[PDB]
Design a protein around this ligand. Structure first.
Ligand SMILES: [Mg+2]
Ligand SMILES: [Zn+2]
Lengths: 37, 621, 95, 229, 681, 229
């Protein structure tokens, strides 16, 4: 009753994320914040 | 048992587009109950869920506002439809519901071919994709209007079925009426005038066998495209009539209907010239020409754009069919005048066989096998006879066109109505000595009937068997083949198979070009293992050979440049559990390369299980 | 059929990938607030009882309508798994 | 008004240029979109009387199947190009107008080359009649009339000059008509006719104009049911 | 072997009485052995029908006998064959055993006969299962009839002769599925046994001996015989057939009428005038419509519903029991514990519903009250009750309701209480309550109709008389049948029926075309000829001639080759009519349909709607106890099966989730389906 | 007027009773008899209003599937015969008229047996309702309304008396339409359309009346092409 090995259930794509250029700059801003003092 | 399921009788949905399907609102309501409940709360119809529930617990209590809610919940969602035997992956297809009144389920006509479903009471089930994911896949890779080409063959499956062809065919056919006096206008100017007046008279038809132009061409010439049809509308030219017309840069001698078909496609897809390049207006559109058209349009213009063409054809085919007024009368089934001849000639010949046995020449057996040989030949004779009749005298015989056009009818079938069904076998298998002299047009006698009955049962008894033998098979195949799935990077093991374009033994030994089909089967959408330079073009290595390429190699083998072809294949793959992109090929239900993650194992096991239902079934071993 | 399905197919390396993208985009479109979109102003999603599709009919019909444009980015590993959900809650209201 | 009468055919229009014009009109009761679209169509094509080249006379040419020296095009191709010509006269006084044109030598003959006539106008000036080489002599008289529908050159057989040749009659500023009847859902009942008809026009008149004329002809004909006998 | 009578209509109830099966005792023929038995053996002649047996696995093993087939002394079907001594044929008949049949040279009935004289030297006969052209001097025995060769059920087919034995089977089984209409009609063309069928079946009520009629009630016809006696003949008003089809005897005799012995006093469920009648001969055009008739779809004229044409009365019998629980007797009372009197209206009688009340899905048919828990009360429900009204009847609403699908108006009810008269009440069963409901079923888009030939199909669209195909004189077609369905299948007989039909329409007459001896192509062309005069003759006199339309279609017709070029339209149309086709205009456009189209009076029946038909649809519902998969029953529909073949279908697609769903959230995921629902909510 | 306008549709009529009415009208141009006859037909069948039995109440009968003693016919047969009844009221003031009839014993019940109502008339007197034997008691109230088209008894569900039973609505007073377009020869040109349409009516309205209503619906619809958008 597990997901099928074949299809959208491919190790090749089970993992894929999406982004908006807005959320792209927002995450890099989190990286910028990493600079201490 | 699925929780969000349903099932009703199905019914043809002519206006419906491949995209959608007609679903009884009454069904939709229960199906999408929870989706509705909540949506009721988002609107003023109900305060809460439990409320919204009791609100619908009785039929008389529903405010018309609820329908507007459900109709809103189903906006872009889609459902799955199933058929009785799910034989292949298309056995289930996704569509956008368009809610409708009543009990029946409106189904599209084009997909009636994928699911083997006719409307003599067939019933389809219906399921619902709940997750946003299940929906995503469902409407992306499971929706009908996307899977147009079969996984078995790169041939379309959205082919204009029965009625559509029948329509599209009748419109594009040309007529020929009476040849009495001279047919020579190619040369004299007195020929144009005399046979133009003689036609005005009663002697020359508008469509006479007169090489260059029958007077039907002489009389009417049409400047622009439209001009042509307008005359038709006014009752000047029928659609099936032979006339001359000016198109883009040519004076083309083609019929009204043909010219119109041209537009239909030209319109379906606005790249007009591209519409002309992939169409053959030199012939009546049979299912094959159409089939072809579809395929071409698919590779050429793009998937969705094809879909449009599909319904475009669907629509006009349907319409034109109605007006064509094709019907079925008893007299339309025409029996040849030659039937009596062929019969009697073979009749007396039977007498000789008898005299030859009465004397002691032919053994008990020799007699038998000689008689049957008489009929088997005589019967096939009447067959090509009836056709010739129609081919020559009634080109537009109802019963005929349907069979010519990809529409409906089998040569062997026609034979039984117009000509005669001649030999039926005894219970065991030994064919009967006496034939069935009758046709269905005339009274199949009390006994020639009984005689033919035997053979009927065996066919039915056989059909009853593949209903499950078909499974016997697919089962086994899927037991061994399920694990097989496309999961890769070009498998680096280049060990390849060579496809033969020639066969050693039809007649003992003579090398010959394989049938365009088999070869197609072998190299369509494959991946070249090694590079091959053939007629002038350099097929590179690893290139996926399109049907156009596999059309080249053949043309090349015809010339004598190649006897084999290097090509990757599953038989030589390295991925232990699985097969790769380059070794599988093209054919996803789509025509490009295979997409990683396709369940090939089964796709395969299925394509092979279905047709199995058509193969004979006497004894396994 | 559906809008530029070919165009879409072409934008991915694998058919089955396009399905995952759209589905995950549709997911986020609803969870973080449905205004998490990249193309609303002039010509956008629309339904006709009114022109109200502008608010919440079909999630993925949107996802696809954006993906067809070149503003979104789908990668195998574009932005670290847990920091994504955090930055998205921070910037998109509507709950 | 508010209930049944306010629920009235919303006549909506969409027209670009003078050639194409879409026209939508809903709601309509049961099977009325058809009841209307069809007649209008039949009218839009036959009835919107128009103009078309009814006869031609090349001076040295006798039959229609001849070819003129210095002239690339053949008689049959030119008589064909003339069917393409769209003219427009302003008043009834003009029933049959003979347009004249004569051009010689290395010149291209276009419709603008016809000598202007007082109450007549040529909307098809740049249309191409022929390509004359050298020593190219073409002097003709092309008849023009006001009629309705399609009339084969055989049916009329016009006789201005004995060596002239009749042409087929394309009497209509309308090119093609097309109407669709798709369902529309209005609250209570779903069964609804929505009639939208698409009209194309050579430019002489406009889709809208055409349509108006059409409906009137119908109206005018519906009045002919007055005096019993 | 003993089974429910199949009275979907008398014919059905009869065939079901006379069919012969294989399986059974087991000791005569189990499930394994097949194909040699299942095949139509040579001897099956006049003893068993070769068509009758049902489709599906159980094929050929179960089949009804033939016309003249009779079980002599010990179960040996003897088919009758008449004697022919020398070149002389007799009216004497011998019911022969399978075996002895082989010792003789037998001939067919089609043999030209002068009386006792055979007429052609080389005439067909068949020794032993072998077709043999024998001489008149060898012809020892002759076939009795065309009828004996098949079964009753089959004999009812018009021109059986022109229809593929294969599809003729469908035709025979279709009749067994004929539902009685409140407007029965005999076929415009019959074979000859319709009479005998209704008669030998016990549909219509016949007169014993001559006399006159006394009273003609809607419920009884007390006839007076000339013998000085008079008897009251009740008529099963409205009775419930096992399968829910109405069985009423409508009196056809007026008051004070001298009756011939054996004449119909009343008509049976489906008889018009002593003749079998199912469905109704309807004028039909046989051409393609948009797609409304695409593979096997049928387009119907709204007009057919205007007149109560295909309309039938059904009756389902809902039943509920007052059970004795140890928790307390389930009372049947007008009391419905939790919410409204609105729903109690038609529950007029305290408890039962009032007769003649229109019941819709979800209305109480009967009320009953059982106890709330298994053994203990409820702590949480304890608080709530106390909050707004502690003193509350702790009884549970378990009341027979109208199951989805439909109900009509209640017509009869039955209640059996404590002091039983002479009835058998099961144990624990305190009392029972029957509710007979009736409902009119006017034909609609979901229904399926089919002619005797085998053309089976469903209504896809009911068109407004406004625009369907109309003939020159204002009369329009009722149904439009797709042509394509005819070539493939091979039953020209329907096409033959329609032609004779057209004739009977204008000639206002019905005919009887026997099995293989019936009407002949020339005879029909002859009647068509007569019809042209009724059609077109009145047209001439009424004042008008031919249309531009009519002429136009003629042009295209000669170009076709259906009419001899050069003859007058009037003459041409006669030719064209004789061919069985006439000119038809669109109706939507008024233009003609390029090319003549046949039309005519074809008989078509309406088929019974099974329970499955009732389009099911389940959202959520019960679940099996041991297996946790969805289960239905009484009012919740029960889920659909997702079979392996279906799994693969998805597997093949990249439907990963969609397949998981089908395996988890939708059927077995206990914790899954729950959170599922809620989540959706 | 004298030339083209005097040469005008000679509207001729032939009507017997209120059921049949033939209507000829010629001359007409090319293919117009069809252009007109067909729409009118479409209208004459769908569009026009009439009368039909909308509800019934037998006094002792509760549901439609019952049978009345002393009465040969069954409820369902009788309600069926009533649909056959054609009534005719004279003015708008009569929207819903309830006709009453009660007959006892050995008499045949025909439509004439209904008690007369001031502004209403029964054109179907001799129609057969029932055959009563002895002790035959039939007392009923049959509603009658003015509507359009077909309305299933299910759709309206009329409620005069709680034990009453609704009937199906057969509101087109038009039975059948039929039109022919035969050639007529007027002097000069032979191609001429002659349109004659035959109309049949249940009696409620008259052929002529119907026709008039028809043409108007058409006209009213041709006006709906006024305001562009
Ligand atoms: Mg089927
Ligand atoms: Zn590989």
């Amino acid at each position: 009753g597990r997901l099928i090995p074949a299809g959208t259930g491919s190790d090749f794509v089970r993992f894929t994320q999406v982004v908006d250029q807005k959320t792209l700059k927002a995450i890099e801003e989190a990286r910028k914040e990493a600079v201490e003092a | 048992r699925v929780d969000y399921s349903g099932r009703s009788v199905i019914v043809v949905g002519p206006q419906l587009k491949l995209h959608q399907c007609g679903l009884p609102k009454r069904m939709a309501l229960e199906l999408f109950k929870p989706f509705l409940l909540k949506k009721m709360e988002e609107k003023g119809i109900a305060p809460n869920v439990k409320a919204a529930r009791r609100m619908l617990e009785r039929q008389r209590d529903i405010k018309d506002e609820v329908w507007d809610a459900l109709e809103e919940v189903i906006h872009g969602k889609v459902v799955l439809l199933n058929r009785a035997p799910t034989l292949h992956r298309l056995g289930i297809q996704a569509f956008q519901p368009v809610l409708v009144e009543g009990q029946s389920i409106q189904l599209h006509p084009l997909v009636c071919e994928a699911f083997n479903a006719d409307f003599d009471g067939d019933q389809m089930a219906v399921h619902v994709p709940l997750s946003s994911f299940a929906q995503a896949e469902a409407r992306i890779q499971m929706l009908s209007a996307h899977n147009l080409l079969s996984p078995a063959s790169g041939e379309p499956l959205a082919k204009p079925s029965r009625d559509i062809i029948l329509g599209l065919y009748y419109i594009t056919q040309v007529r020929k009426e009476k040849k009495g006096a001279g047919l020579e206008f190619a040369t004299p100017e007195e020929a144009l005038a005399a046979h133009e007046r003689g036609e005005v008279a009663l002697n020359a038809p508008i469509k006479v066998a007169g090489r260059e132009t029958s007077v039907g061409r002489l009389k009417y010439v049409f400047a622009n495209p439209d001009e042509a049809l307008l005359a038709v509308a006014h009752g000047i030219v029928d659609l099936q009539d032979v006339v001359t017309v000016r198109y883009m840069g040519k004076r083309l001698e083609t019929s009204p209907g043909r010219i119109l078909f041209a537009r239909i496609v030209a319109e379906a897809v606005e790249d007009e010239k591209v519409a002309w390049e992939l169409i053959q207006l030199d012939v009546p559109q049979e299912k094959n020409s159409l089939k072809d058209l579809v395929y071409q349009a698919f590779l050429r213009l793009g998937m969705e754009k094809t879909a449009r063409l599909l319904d475009a054809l669907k629509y006009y085919g349907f319409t034109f069919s109605t007006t064509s007024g094709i019907t079925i009368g008893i007299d339309d089934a025409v029996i040849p005048e030659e039937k009596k001849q062929y019969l009697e000639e073979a009749d007396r010949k039977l007498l000789q066989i008898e005299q030859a046995y009465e004397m002691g020449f032919l053994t008990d057996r020799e007699r038998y096998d000689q008689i049957l040989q008489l009929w088997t030949e005589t019967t096939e004779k009447v067959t090509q006879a009836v056709f010739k009749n129609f081919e020559e005298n009634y080109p537009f015989n109802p019963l005929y066109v349907m069979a010519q056009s990809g529409a409906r009818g089998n040569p062997q079938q026609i034979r039984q109505l117009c000509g005669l069904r001649g030999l039926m076998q005894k219970p065991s298998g030994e064919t009967f000595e006496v034939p069935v002299r009758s046709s269905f047009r005339e009274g199949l006698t009390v006994l020639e009937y009984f005689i033919s009955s035997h053979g009927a049962r065996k066919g039915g008894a056989d059909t009853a068997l593949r209903t499950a033998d078909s499974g016997y098979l697919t089962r086994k195949l899927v037991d061994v083949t399920h694990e097989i799935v496309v999961r890769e990077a070009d498998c680096g093991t280049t060990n390849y198979i060579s496809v033969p374009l020639f066969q050693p033994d039809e007649v003992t030994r003579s090398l010959r070009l394989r049938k365009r089909a088999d070869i197609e089967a072998g190299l369509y959408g494959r991946v070249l293992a090694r590079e091959v330079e053939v007629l002038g073009v350099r097929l590179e290595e690893g290139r996926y050979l399109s049907m156009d390429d596999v059309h080249l190699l053949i043309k090349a083998a015809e010339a004598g440049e190649i006897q084999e072809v290097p090509v990757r294949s599953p038989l030589t793959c390295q991925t232990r559990y699985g097969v790769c992109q380059k070794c599988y090929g093209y054919d996803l239900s789509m025509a490009r390369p295979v997409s990683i993650g396709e369940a090939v194992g089964i796709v395969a096991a299925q394509s092979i299980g279905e047709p199995g239902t058509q193969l004979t079934m006497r004894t396994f071993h | 059929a559906e809008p530029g399905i070919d165009k879409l197919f072409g934008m991915v390396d694998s058919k089955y990938r396009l399905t995952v993208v759209v589905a995950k985009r549709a997911q986020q479109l609803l969870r973080h607030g449905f205004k998490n979109t990249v193309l609303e102003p002039e010509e956008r999603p629309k339904m006709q009882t009114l022109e109200g599709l502008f608010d919440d009919p079909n999630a993925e019909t949107w996802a696809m309508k954006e993906l067809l444009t070149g503003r979104l980015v789908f990668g195998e590993n574009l932005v670290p798994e847990d920091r994504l959900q955090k930055e998205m809650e921070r910037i998109y209201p509507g709950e | 008004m508010l209930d049944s009468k306010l629920k009235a055919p919303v006549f909506t229009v969409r027209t670009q240029g003078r050639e194409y014009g879409e026209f939508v009109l809903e709601p309509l009761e049961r099977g009325f979109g058809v009841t209307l679209g069809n007649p209008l169509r039949r009218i839009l094509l036959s009835s919107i009387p128009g103009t078309a080249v009814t006869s031609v006379y090349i001076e040295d040419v006798l039959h229609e199947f001849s070819t003129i020296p210095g002239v690339k095009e053949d008689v049959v191709e030119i008589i064909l190009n003339l069917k393409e010509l769209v003219v427009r006269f302003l008043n009834p006084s003009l029933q049959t107008v003979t347009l004249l044109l004569k051009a010689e030598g290395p010149k291209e003959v276009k419709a603008r080359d016809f000598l202007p006539v007082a109450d007549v106008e040529i909307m098809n000036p740049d249309l191409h009649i022929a390509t004359l080489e050298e020593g190219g002599r073409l002097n003709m008289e092309v008849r023009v009339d006001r009629g309705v529908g399609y009339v084969p050159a055989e049916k009329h057989g016009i006789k201005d000059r004995i060596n002239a040749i009749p042409v087929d009659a394309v009497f209509s500023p309308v090119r093609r008509v097309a109407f669709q009847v798709e369902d529309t859902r209005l609250g209570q009942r779903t069964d609804l006719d929505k009639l939208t008809l698409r009209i194309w026009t050579d430019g002489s008149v406009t889709p809208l104009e055409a349509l108006n004329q059409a409906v009137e002809i119908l109206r005018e004909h519906l009045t002919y049911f007055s005096n019993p006998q | 072997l003993s089974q429910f009578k199949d009275e979907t209509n008398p014919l059905s109830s009869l065939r079901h009485k006379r069919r012969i099966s294989a399986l059974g005792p087991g000791g005569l023929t189990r499930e394994r052995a097949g194909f040699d038995v299942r095949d139509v053996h040579r001897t099956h002649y006049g003893r068993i029908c070769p068509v009758e047996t049902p489709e599906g696995a159980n094929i050929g093993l179960i089949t009804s006998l033939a016309a003249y087939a009779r079980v002599d002394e010990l179960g040996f079907i003897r088919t009758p064959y008449r004697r022919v001594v020398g070149g002389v044929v007799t009216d004497e008949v011998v019911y022969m055993t399978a075996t002895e049949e082989d010792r003789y040279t037998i001939a067919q009935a089609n043999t030209p006969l002068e009386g006792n004289r055979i007429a052609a030297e080389r005439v067909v006969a068949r020794r032993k299962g072998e077709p043999v052209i024998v001489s008149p001097e060898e012809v020892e025995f002759m076939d009795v009839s065309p009828k004996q060769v098949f079964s009753v059920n089959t004999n009812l087919i018009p021109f059986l002769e022109h229809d593929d034995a294969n599809r003729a089977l469908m035709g025979s089984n279709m009749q067994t599925q004929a539902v009685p209409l409140i407007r029965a009609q005999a076929p415009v063309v019959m074979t000859g046994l319709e009479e005998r069928v209704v008669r030998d079946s016990l549909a219509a009520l016949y007169a014993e001996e001559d006399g006159e009629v006394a009273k003609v009630d809607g419920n009884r016809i007390v006839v007076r015989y000339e013998d000085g006696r008079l008897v009251e003949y009740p008529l099963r008003r409205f009775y419930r057939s096992n399968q829910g089809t109405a069985l009423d005897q409508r009196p056809r005799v007026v008051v004070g009428q001298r009756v011939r012995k054996g004449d119909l006093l009343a008509d049976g469920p489906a008889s018009e005038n002593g003749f079998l009648a199912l469905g109704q001969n309807v004028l039909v055009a046989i051409m393609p419509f948009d797609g409304y008739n695409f593979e096997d779809a049928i387009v119907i004229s709204e007009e057919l519903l205007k007149r109560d044409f295909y309309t039938s009365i059904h009756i389902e019998r809902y039943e509920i029991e007052a059970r004795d629980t140890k928790l307390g007797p389930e009372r049947i009372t007008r009391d419905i514990p939790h919410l409204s009197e609105a729903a109690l209206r038609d529950l007029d009688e305290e408890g039962v519903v009032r007769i003649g009340a229109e019941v819709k899905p979800g209305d109480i048919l009967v009320g009953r009250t059982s106890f709330k828990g298994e053994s203990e009360p409820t702590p949480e429900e304890r608080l709530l009750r106390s909050i707004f009204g502690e003193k509350a009847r702790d009884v549970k609403d378990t009341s027979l309701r109208v199951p989805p699908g439909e109900g009509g108006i209640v017509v009869r009810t039955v209640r059996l209480r404590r002091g039983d008269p002479g009835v058998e009440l099961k144990p624990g069963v305190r009392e029972v309550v029957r509710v007979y409901v009736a409902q009119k079923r006017k034909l609609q888009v979901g229904d399926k109709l089919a002619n005797r030939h085998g053309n089976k199909g469903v209504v896809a669209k009911i068109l407004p008389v406004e625009d369907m195909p109309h003939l020159p004189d204002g009369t329009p077609v009722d149904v439009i049948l797709n042509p394509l369905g005819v070539p493939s299948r091979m039953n020209l007989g329907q096409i033959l029926e329609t032609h004779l039909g057209l004739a009977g329409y204008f000639l206002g007459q019905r005919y009887i075309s026997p099995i293989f001896d019936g009407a002949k192509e020339p005879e029909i062309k002859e009647l068509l000829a007569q019809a042209f005069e009724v059609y077109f003759g009145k047209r001439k006199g009424e004042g008008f001639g031919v249309d531009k339309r009519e002429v136009e279609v003629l042009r295209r017709a000669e170009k076709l080759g259906l009419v001899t070029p050069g003859k007058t339209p009037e003459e041409q149309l006669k030719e064209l009519f004789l061919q069985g086709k006439v000119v038809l205009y669109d109706g939507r456009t008024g233009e003609p349909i390029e090319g003549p189209i046949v039309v005519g009076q074809m008989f078509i029946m309406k088929l019974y709607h099974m329970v499955e038909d009732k389009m099911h649809a389940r959202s959520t519902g019960p679940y099996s106890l041991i297996t946790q998969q969805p289960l239905g029953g009484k009012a919740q529909f029960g889920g659909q099966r997702f079979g392996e073949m279906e799994v693969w279908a998805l597997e093949a697609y990249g439907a990963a989730h969609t397949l998981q769903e089908m395996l988890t959230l939708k059927s077995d995921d206990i914790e899954g389906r729950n959170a599922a629902y809620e989540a959706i909510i």
